[PDB]
Ligand binder design. Structure first.
Ligand SMILES: OC[C@H](C[C@H]1CCCO1)Nc1ncnc2[nH]ccc12
Ligand SMILES: [Cl-]
Length: 167
């Protein structure tokens, strides 16, 4: 039993809800919140910009030190950093950004990072401003993640479409 509430259950392990991920994490304080990151950990917009704003830019300051030490992530890769005031940890995961010409096949690799964590709050990878088809991202999530994932969907019209179209 966990404290996630109001989710629709899609499979044995994937749950979904219409929610603002910033407000969800603040309420639940999950062990792991997933950020929709880029390889530079520059948290400018979309989920990333919103999560960073909620930390009063502490996420960005931590991220800049991480990059200065380690260099950029790989597309499809991840790193674990602090969750600041939102969660114990933030798993920064880089899904392909179609608006940059990145290979959509890397979306499965990106979701594989979730399997290193028993329970996660997360957005749909490569959705929103990353330019991929969200119905596709949900399908890859369900077919790749085996741990317990609670998916927050910002857009109301999008959430209803994912549920109604889910197989
Ligand atoms: O796939 C990531 C989605 C994409 C959106 C853009 C259009 C339809 O869905 N973004 C977010 N999902 C959940 N919480 C969020 N908080 C801030 C942004 C955000
Ligand atoms: Cl977005």
């Amino acid at each position: 039993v966990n404290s996630f509430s109001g989710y629709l259950k899609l499979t044995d392990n994937v749950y979904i809800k219409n929610a603002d991920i910033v407000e969800e994490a603040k309420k639940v304080k999950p062990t792991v919140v997933v950020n929709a990151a880029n390889v530079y950990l520059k948290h400018g917009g979309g989920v990333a910009g919103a999560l960073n704003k909620a930390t009063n830019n502490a996420m960005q300051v931590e991220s800049d030190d991480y990059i200065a030490t380690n260099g950029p992530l790989k597309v499809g890769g991840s790193c674990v950093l602090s969750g600041h005031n939102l969660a114990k940890h933030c798993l920064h995961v880089v899904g392909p950004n179609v608006n940059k010409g990145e290979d959509i096949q890397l979306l499965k690799s990106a979701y594989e990072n979730f399997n290193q964590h028993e329970v996660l709050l997360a957005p749909l990878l490569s959705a929103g401003i990353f330019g991929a088809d969200p119905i596709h991202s949900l399908r890859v999530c369900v077919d790749t993640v085996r741990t317990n994932v609670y998916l927050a969907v910002f857009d109301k019209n999008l959430y209803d479409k994912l549920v109604s179209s889910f197989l």
